[PDB]
Homo-oligomer: 184 residues x 5
């Protein structure tokens, strides 16, 4: 019912496990993975085990189905997936942040492609575990721009103080890149 | 079950919150976000909290999952998302309307691309909160056209008075741009 | 559960309303839109109202969500959408049929592109409300062809009399356009 | 719930009807289409009729919604669709098989495009009602190849006798077309 | 409800059967395929048979619907599909591994395309039944690289010992291919 989980393919295991656990908790099945094993198994417990195993099988890619082929419970599958991918880092936060700080808008590139690159970098940083607020995102975006946008920078800083987000800043930046391109 | 909600990525928070609230109300779960906290928690209340948290987790992008990683209720998640994005403007309505009023059909561009641009502008204006009626949409579309369409403008104004919408006007405009292109 | 309804964007309102009404009737909820308002509201009636409003919200585009933002029932939303789009025509049937009758296969164009154009025209005509039988579709397709296909026309007319549909006719036409292209 | 049915657009009516009947039988609703009309209608029968009509409406294209606009039961809709498309042939099996037997791999074309063409032809033949076994598919694929693959043909014939399918044969053929392209 | 199963088209039958069996077990229906035939049939057993047959029909391609057209139970359908595809090999593991070991990064190709090719090869190997650990994947990826990456190889080997996976290794490799391309 929750088709918003990307199948696990060895990348971003923390997000996949979080979404899988949320989905299992939605179906009142997470007690199999988390709760203690009951002394006597009931029909409800067997149904919950089947549902958890089926969900994990559904949200595993064809390459990773070998983790569920053996007659093991969903708890064992998650334990193995943890032992292989639990504490392992997804990327280098310092490298990504160095790339982000070195980002600069080029004359040939338009603001749409630059915004896409900035969004990809920010999304990768946030997926890696870094915590970036909206103000920090805006500051990075503004420092990754040439000096032709100083007018809109001043206007945003002085006027839109209680109304600033990434979307509004990007919209204003595109609005004035239209004028900047016209004035060349 | 409601897969028509775009995951939240920091853009158009009002629409996302409205759709999420509608979906939660559909599942008889919105009482968690809206209703007062009961003195004693029951199994039904815990199930509702789990369902609301799972829904919000499902309809949040991978970048924004940090708002739900902490052991907080769905109400707290929505409160934080509001504190970051509730009253913030999505775009500049005056800038969008200035761009729309300055729109003009060029000789190289066909009516399909012009209609797509007009539709994108109108959709952005409506998402920003502006209220545009069908007559206003038609008036903008007609004033964004050259003088070669005056015949169809007069025919639509005089004949199709109780039958005018954007779709019919666009269809007639394409029908006569065929003839205009033939007569060149 | 019925994800086969295109969200309403101001085009083809009759089809959208028909599909929405069918979906509401499937969920035993159409009594809210159609049935009379009960003297005393019950929990079942409130649940039905919530479900209908949530369904209509789900199957409305982001541009048209303003019809549901106000605290109004699903019946009121449908009444407003009717008052704006109920009896309004979708396109010009005479113009579409004139374009269809004037369709002719060109030497440069292959039969696949011609079939796609013919299918698009027929689909638009049927969506506009016109009633076209299979024999009429076949007749239009055959009269929109050059004289190189007279052999297959005669073979289809004489042999396949109780076995003729658009798909079979198109398949035979492609089969012999292979030979016609070979014989040039 | 069964979103694997392509909406009916006048092509492949047998497959669409088979899938629709299977879906209706899954929901315990096929008794409306198949079973006799009860003397007295009940709430369950009306619910089943609504569900069947809604399912058929959902899995009908916008062009074919005119078959359900009138206040008719799902049984009547299926009866009309049968009267228009039940016994009519989908394509010419002899023509498709003549095209398949005449298929030959060209020097310019790679094995991927040839395999795609062969798969499309086989799929069309199977949809038309023809019965082709795996051995026949393999024989057609092998006879549609040049003499440069005789080594792999002999190896497959002699060694892989209890292990031959279309996928394995295609994989071996690509494996040795790598070598054949290298040896040129 | 489980839309993550690719319809069966004669390729990768083991994965399709595993996913179908998991889905059937989720719905408490696998007892039809696995359990013994009861002496007396009940309404529950007939409902389970209908559900299993409908699921198998849904997750079968249009080419393979002939396995279910006849009035046979889901158990018979699976038995026939096994008799045609159960023990048959999907590809040549030795050929795939020879291709993987011979993989080498070329100057023209970027690391993204090379990573895509490596991922495709590894996925095909894992689908064929081979068991490859994360360390083996990393070793193959590293031996499929030129000598310009020896610095990052040494850094990963010495520093990231308890933190190594394919994703992190690929990210570091791209990070330093940026520098390598800059230094040319």
């Amino acid at each position: 019912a929750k088709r918003n989980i990307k199948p696990f393919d060895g990348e971003k295991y923390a997000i996949w496990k979080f979404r899988i656990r949320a989905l299992l908790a939605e179906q009142d099945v997470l007690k199999v993975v988390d709760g203690l094993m009951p002394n006597e198994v009931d029909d409800s417990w067997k149904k919950a085990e089947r549902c958890a195993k089926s969900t994990i099988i559904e949200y595993l890619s064809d390459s990773f189905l070998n983790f569920a082929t053996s007659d093991i419970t969903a708890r064992q599958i998650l334990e193995n997936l943890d032992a292989v991918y639990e504490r392992k880092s997804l990327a280098s936060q310092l490298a990504l942040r160095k790339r982000l700080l070195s980002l600069k808008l080029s004359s040939e590139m338009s603001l749409l492609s630059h915004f896409h690159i900035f969004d990809e970098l920010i999304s990768e940083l946030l997926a890696a575990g870094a915590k970036i607020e909206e103000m920090d995102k805006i500051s990075h975006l503004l420092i990754t721009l040439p000096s032709c946008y100083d007018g809109i920078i001043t206007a945003i800083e002085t006027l839109s103080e209680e109304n600033l987000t990434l979307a509004f800043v990007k919209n204003r930046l595109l609005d004035q890149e239209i004028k900047i391109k016209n004035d060349h």
